[PDB]
């Protein structure tokens, strides 16, 4: 058993993994639809690698070190110039109300922590702790009335912009301090798409 570490649960799970690509737009007054802000309920059940790894086991606890990689681009060739934008990356915790408009009350709310990421700087980062009501995240639950990790909402803070600027935000979830319980037969790659 030569230093079995590499297959330890930490080494196994704790890896940066893109879980979503959230696209937002600049509040240009031309015809911009409700794409002015993006919303995404934190969930592993869309990414297959992390899902398949977690579903080896029945229960789990883990902190969550989300990292945000924002990249923008002018939409049309009317580039000209446009000042460095700022992005509000709000992490709506569990059970809290999610935004609905660009400038809903939720964006100013004290509760919801928020990053103000300036473009062209180092990637933003928060560390959500274990936000479970249970003492462990249940991946399989034979019972009656899924777990909540929160929502991530993203918008451009700037307002009166002449040129449209699309921007994609890659969320890089790295589960941290994982503990897991009750191994299981791994589901097959076949049935995830």
């Amino acid at each position: 058993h030569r230093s079995r570490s590499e297959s330890s649960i930490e080494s196994f799970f704790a890896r940066g993994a893109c879980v979503t690509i959230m696209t937002v737009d600049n509040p240009a007054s031309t015809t911009n639809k409700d794409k002015l802000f993006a919303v995404w309920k934190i969930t592993y059940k869309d990414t297959v690698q992390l899902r398949r790894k977690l579903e080896f086991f029945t229960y789990s606890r883990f902190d969550m070190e989300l990292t945000f990689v924002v990249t923008a681009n002018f939409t049309e060739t009317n580039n000209g110039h446009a000042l460095n934008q700022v992005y509000q990356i709000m992490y709506v915790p569990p059970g809290a109300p999610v935004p609905e408009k660009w400038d809903d009350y939720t964006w100013q709310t004290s509760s919801n922590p928020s990053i103000f990421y300036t473009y062209g700087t180092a990637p933003a980062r928060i560390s959500v702790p274990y936000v479970g009501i249970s003492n462990a995240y249940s991946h399989f639950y034979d019972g009656f009335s899924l777990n909540d990790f929160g929502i991530l909402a993203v918008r451009v803070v700037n307002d009166h912009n002449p040129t449209k600027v699309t921007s994609k935000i890659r969320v890089y979830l790295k589960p941290k301090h994982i503990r897991v319980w009750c191994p299981r037969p791994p589901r097959a790659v076949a049935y995830y798409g």
């Binding site: 249970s134 034979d142 019972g143 009750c182 299981r184 037969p185």
Partner: protein, 222 residues
């Protein structure tokens, strides 16, 4: 021949040698609720099932099996929260001329799939796999069955031992929970090697489950 007893119940075990404790943790009370260990902790022997050649498997949920079962079933309705470990004796009494094997798999959170409560909860009669009815070699969820031997389990190979014993501790995300809603454990008995027997012998051997709820404790009684 070890003759076991729990109050007003008694069982005739061969001997408790091949006894698997699931996850090496014996059932324990919580280290706050009442503990009706008076008479609810007894052997509830379910209605036997007949293993023919064509059988694909059987399954029960726990404690949904013991829902109409006397005091445990009562406790588990008139209290709001409860937790219970179990001792599942699967006795499968056959002659020396029958042959086959059974994989007895205790499954945490055995969410099956072919959805509704009455459908996912067969009670005391249990359900059966099929080649609704989940897929046998999948346990509903698209699993390869060999991998199933990660679960707390035991083989009943008719040439050798004819009975298994699984001692299940309380497995749940929570310390205590509503039993009427949520089945912690799940038992699936699948025939690994199919039944076969000599020419004019008994063509369907029986299988009997005996479930002693260990270290049960409930709160709060309405």
């Amino acid at each position: 021949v070890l003759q076991l007893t729990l109050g007003n119940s008694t069982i005739t075990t061969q001997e408790a040698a091949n006894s698997v404790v699931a996850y090496g943790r014996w059932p324990e009370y919580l280290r706050q609720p009442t503990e009706p260990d008076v008479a609810a902790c007894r052997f509830y022997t379910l209605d036997t099932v007949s293993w023919t050649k064509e059988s694909r498997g059987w399954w029960w949920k726990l404690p949904d099996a013991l829902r109409d079962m006397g005091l445990f079933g009562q406790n588990m309705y008139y209290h709001y929260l409860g937790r219970s470990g179990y001792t599942v004796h699967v006795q499968c009494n056959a002659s020396k001329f029958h042959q086959g094997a059974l994989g007895v798999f205790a499954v945490p959170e055995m969410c099956l799939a072919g959805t509704s409560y009455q459908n996912a909860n067969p009670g005391e009669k249990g359900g059966t796999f099929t080649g609704f009815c989940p897929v046998d070699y999948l346990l509903g969820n698209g699993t390869l069955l060999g991998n199933a031997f990660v679960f707390p389990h035991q083989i009943i190979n008719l040439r050798t031992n004819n009975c298994a014993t699984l001692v299940l501790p309380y497995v749940n995300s929570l310390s205590i929970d509503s039993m009427v809603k949520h089945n912690n454990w799940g038992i699936a008995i699948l025939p690994l090697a199919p039944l076969n027997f000599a020419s004019e012998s008994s063509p369907e051997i029986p299988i009997t489950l005996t479930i002693a709820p260990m270290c049960c404790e409930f709160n709060g009684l309405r």
